[PDB]
């Protein structure tokens, strides 16, 4: 939904989306090669689906060529200083991929606006949306945009023949927040089921070595284990086929 979104958001209104109750398979998108850059910080490009986070934050917008390089931990640059400020300890992965064959259009695509100028840099992950006319000179402009006083937002106007520098590069940045129960975590494989062999099983929670055999015990719909009179594991419900 966030990557295959047809309708993105601009840069002065950079997005953020908490996502919960997921199995978050990062390897299906990481191994898609539809990305100009997959830059991970704090964590590894692989070695992710073995991580269980509290929530993830999917920001989604469109920037130009060099602005992607701008997007990095603790950077200084037009977007990074006045549209979307990453911290220095950003734990997550930036996803950049070109959209010149989708978003570019003849005559220009003037729908995307970036913040021209502002007095100060943003807090890490700060959301600055105020559309107050850029004040400067010596007087509060009061809307007239007097001398030294200009508009804060500037359109892009994506022309299809523009070079990569002006091309619409769609970017999505994910951060990994850890507080609380981890409700989003990468999938876990499940090998085939083998019976009648001393195997070293690890069912979803519990481990151990045994000889798995089709039983005739009737668990209750919600029970998972079975125990012996001395509190030893004796029956396990196959969490794939009950």
């Amino acid at each position, epitope marked *: 939904e966030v990557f295959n979104a047809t309708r993105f958001a601009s840069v002065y209104a950079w997005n953020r989306k908490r996502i919960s109750n997921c199995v978050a398979d990062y390897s299906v998108l990481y191994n898609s090669a539809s990305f100009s850059t997959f830059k991970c910080y704090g964590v590894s490009p692989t070695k992710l689906n073995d991580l269980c986070f509290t929530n993830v934050y999917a920001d989604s917008f469109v920037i130009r060529g*060099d602005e992607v390089r701008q997007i990095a931990p603790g950077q200084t*640059g037009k977007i990074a200083d006045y549209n979307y400020k990453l911290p220095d300890d950003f734990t997550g992965c930036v996803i950049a991929w070109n959209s010149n064959n989708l978003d570019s259009k003849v005559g220009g695509n003037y729908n995307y606006l970036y913040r021209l100028f*502002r007095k100060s840099n943003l807090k890490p992950f700060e959301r600055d949306i105020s559309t107050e006319i850029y004040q400067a*000179g010596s007087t509060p402009c009061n809307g007239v945009e007097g001398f030294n006083c200009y508009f804060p937002l500037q359109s892009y106007g994506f022309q299809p023949t*523009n*070079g990569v520098g002006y091309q619409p590069y769609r970017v999505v940045v994910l951060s990994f927040e850890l507080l609380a129960p981890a409700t989003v975590c990468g999938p876990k494989k499940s090998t085939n089921l083998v019976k009648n062999k001393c195997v070293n099983f690890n069912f979803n929670g519990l481990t151990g070595t045994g000889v798995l055999t089709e039983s005739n015990k009737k668990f209750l719909p919600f029970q998972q284990f079975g125990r012996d009179i001395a509190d030893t594991t004796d029956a396990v419900r196959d969490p794939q086929t009950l």
Partner: antibody, heavy 116, light 111 residues
Framework: VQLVESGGGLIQPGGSLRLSCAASGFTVSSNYMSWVRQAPGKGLEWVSVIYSGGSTYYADSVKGRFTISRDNSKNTLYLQMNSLRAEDTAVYYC????????????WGQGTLVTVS | SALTQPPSASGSPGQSVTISCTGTSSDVGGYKYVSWYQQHPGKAPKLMIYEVSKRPSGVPDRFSGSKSGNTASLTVSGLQAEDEADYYCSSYEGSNNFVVFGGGTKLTVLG
């Protein structure tokens, strides 16, 4: 916009010419400003800028050594230089503006700074 | 790289002249913003053609040349007794926020 840059002249490598670009007419604080210089018979050299967020940039032969400064108010605006070479021989100017956007329109009267 | 130009152009007072501005496709055929500058010897560098269809506010109208593909060009009609000056282009390189300038065009009128 009375940008009277002063303190320029002939200096051997090592000195730090605290150019004082008076911001008497236009602001240098909480705004965008730029320092540049032109060699005899040459275009302009983008040596420094300062943003509203106080951010700064230098070009290649001036990275690591050139450093911008200013009083907090509209008192003045500085540009500090280190390890000066003969190539740097360029009369200094101030460029009211910030980069390719916000073109440079207002300048100083011209301080003669020969770096050799 | 540099927006190189022939150092000299001659002409008659009253006619037009096109001051060229030439660099590779590395810059001029990648962006949409050029900036022309004209400067009397001694004057402050005064911009001429930024947003190539546009010029600064108070500049006269005989200016406003265009950009064709791999080169920009300022087309100034009616060479005045004031049109003698030096010319320098300006734009943004395709790397690390570098800004490139022009080599210099001297408008040389006959004696």
């Amino acid at each position: 916009v009375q940008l009277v840059e002063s303190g320029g002249g002939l200096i051997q490598p090592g000195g730090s010419l605290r150019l004082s670009c008076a911001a008497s007419g236009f602001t240098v604080s909480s705004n965008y400003m730029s320092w540049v210089r032109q060699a005899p018979g040459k275009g302009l050299e983008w040596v420094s800028v300062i943003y509203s967020g106080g951010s700064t940039y230098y070009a290649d032969s001036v990275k690591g050594r050139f450093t911008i400064s200013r009083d907090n108010s509209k008192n003045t605006l500085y540009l500090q230089m280190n390890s000066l070479r003969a190539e740097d021989t360029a009369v200094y100017y101030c460029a009211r503006g910030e980069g390719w956007e916000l073109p440079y329109d207002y300048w100083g009267q011209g301080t003669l700074v020969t770096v050799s | 790289s540099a927006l190189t130009q022939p150092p000299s152009a001659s002409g008659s007072p009253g006619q037009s002249v096109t001051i060229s501005c030439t660099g590779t496709s590395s810059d001029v055929g990648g962006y949409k913003y050029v900036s022309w500058y004209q400067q009397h010897p001694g004057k402050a560098p005064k911009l001429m053609i930024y947003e190539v269809s546009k010029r600064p506010s108070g500049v006269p109208d005989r200016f406003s040349g265009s950009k064709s593909g791999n080169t920009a060009s300022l087309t100034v009609s009616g060479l005045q007794a004031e049109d003698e000056a030096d010319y320098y282009c300006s734009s943004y390189e395709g790397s690390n926020n570098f800004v490139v300038f022009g080599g210099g065009t001297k408008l040389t009128v006959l004696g």
